[PDB]
């Protein structure tokens, strides 16, 4: 093509934005649960735990 | 879609009728009067416009009542004051405002609305038999 | 960042008897003081890894698609002498070939001073070297002009 119609070849993927929007959820809850460190900042406790 | 239901608009009609309830059951007369005022019996009824017809009753002090409700049913009136309630029996009301008791019963049988305030004031119930409301030429009949 | 703060870490408010928010800091990002946790920083890569095989394949494809073009005519040594350091001759040549609005690019490898001296009076005229031009400038060139001798060597370059 050229730099007036350039398009990918279906190279475009979704992005789970945890901060914005409500139509796909992905907002306040942001898929982290409702309680515990997993639902809080600096979660994901040590893999060996 | 819609059929565009035609209904009367800005129209008024209020005929006059009268009966005598000497020895007649209260309930039937009451429901017939409710039908007359609410306009269910009419076939062009419009709720938000004129509904009722002027109503007069003569000699409402000879009502009949089955059973011992004269000493079984009691009517109460409690004022805003503490303990300000008075209770009256059926036989006592027979020499008291039974016409106003009929008034209250039929207004209770009407739908609750501010039109009911204007509906019920068209009812003129008299314990006696003589009044000047006959000057409007009420239609004498039965089952009103 | 949050290291740009000024003052102590003392609480501006009291632990109790406060009918307001927590507000345990002085120059919070949600406060007017600022200091957002996120923002552009001058330490990212801004580039990634690519392989020469695909680059050469794409470059050869662009060479093919530009040889398929019309206004890609040959250039040689004779007109380098026939042109001078004067901008006049270049403009006369462009007018005689209606290359005014065209973005035509010139290819240089002998590094003639006359060519590089010119191509500065219009926003569409410029000259580039064979090893100093990439796929974009090859195709943004919009039917450029290329030398003659080097092409066979360029054939080996894919």
């Amino acid at each position: 093509l050229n730099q007036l119609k350039s398009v990918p070849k279906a190279r475009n993927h979704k992005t789970k934005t945890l901060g914005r929007g409500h139509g796909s959820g992905l907002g306040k809850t942001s898929g982290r649960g409702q309680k515990g460190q997993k639902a809080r900042k600096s979660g994901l406790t040590r893999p060996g735990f | 879609k819609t059929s565009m239901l035609t209904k009367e608009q800005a129209n008024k009609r209020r005929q006059w009728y009268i009966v005598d309830a000497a020895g007649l059951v209260l309930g039937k007369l009451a429901v017939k009067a409710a039908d007359l005022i609410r306009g269910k019996n009419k076939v062009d009824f419009t709720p938000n416009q004129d509904c009722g017809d002027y109503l007069i009753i003569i000699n409402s002090d000879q009502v009949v009542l089955t059973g011992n409700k004269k000493e079984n049913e009691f009517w109460y009136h409690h004022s805003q004051y503490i303990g300000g309630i008075k209770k009256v029996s059926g036989r006592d009301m027979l020499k008291k405002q039974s016409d106003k008791l009929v008034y209250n019963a039929v207004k209770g049988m009407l739908p609750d609305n501010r039109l009911s305030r204007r509906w019920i004031t068209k009812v003129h119930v008299f314990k006696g038999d003589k009044h000047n409301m006959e000057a409007q030429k009420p239609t004498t009949l039965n089952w009103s | 960042t949050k290291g740009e703060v000024r003052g102590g870490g003392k609480k501006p408010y009291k632990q109790k008897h406060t009918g307001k928010a927590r507000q345990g800091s002085t120059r919070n990002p949600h406060f007017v003081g600022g200091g957002i946790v996120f923002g552009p920083k001058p330490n990212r890569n801004y580039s990634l890894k690519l392989n020469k095989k695909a680059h050469t394949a794409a470059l050869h494809t662009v060479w093919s698609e530009k040889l398929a073009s019309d206004n890609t005519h040959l250039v040689d040594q004779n007109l380098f002498n026939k042109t001078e350091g004067k901008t006049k001759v270049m403009m006369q040549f462009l007018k005689s070939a209606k290359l005014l609005d065209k973005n035509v690019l010139f290819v240089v490898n002998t590094l003639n001073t006359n060519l590089e001296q010119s191509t500065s009076n219009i926003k569409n005229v410029q000259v580039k070297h064979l090893d100093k031009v990439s796929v974009r400038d090859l195709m943004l060139a919009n039917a450029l002009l290329v030398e003659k001798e080097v092409l066979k060597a360029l054939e080996g370059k894919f």
Binding site: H22, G27, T29 | K1, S3 | -
Partner: protein
């Protein structure tokens, strides 16, 4: 006049040359379209329908109703769905409904 005409799945009482509204028929404006699913015309009574009597309407316009912005929200829950409905209609009148 008086004529009961069943358009779509709803009945309408019409008289001589009355412009009224029904569901859209997906037809060019200006033509004449006949309907036979007609009852109660010319003081004639049929049980399912009537024969020898048909209606002939002309199409005047195809329009839409207002934006029916149906919005569904559930209190204290993560659900808020918005939509705007514009439903087509045809304005038409009968010309020479036969009896």
């Amino acid at each position: 006049m008086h004529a009961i005409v069943v358009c779509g799945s709803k009945q309408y009482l019409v008289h001589e040359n009355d412009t009224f509204f029904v569901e859209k028929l997906e037809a060019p404006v200006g033509k004449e379209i006949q309907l036979d699913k007609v009852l109660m015309l010319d003081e004639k009574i049929g049980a399912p329908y009537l024969e020898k009597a048909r209606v002939v309407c002309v199409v005047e316009k195809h329009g839409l109703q207002r934006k029916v912005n149906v919005i569904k929200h559930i209190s204290q829950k993560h659900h808020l769905k918005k939509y705007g409905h514009r439903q087509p209609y045809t304005k038409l009148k009968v010309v020479r409904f036969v009896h």
